[PDB]
Amino acid sequence: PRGSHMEERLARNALEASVEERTRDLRMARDRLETEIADHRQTTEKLQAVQQ
Amino acid sequence: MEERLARNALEASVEERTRDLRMARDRLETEIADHRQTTEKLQAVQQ
Description:
Two copies of one chain form a homodimer. Chain A is mainly α. The first copy, chain A, is built from one helix and no strands.
């Protein structure tokens, strides 16, 4: 006993799960990298201030 | 001179971090762009 769009909804669930998990991974990578860039910016700004 | 060598080593370290962070940024930019085109194509095949 199957709905007329059951297979299509299951395919949608599969694709959605994968795409959203990739999205979370890329958000996390982006977060880590922004934090590193901020550390680097603080470091360079402070070293610039003391160079003269 | 010791202070000059230490200075240059720190300078070199900082320039290296700049290069690595730019490489990482460029790569993640491409990854994000590619993912976005996947999501847009996904979304349009439904509607």
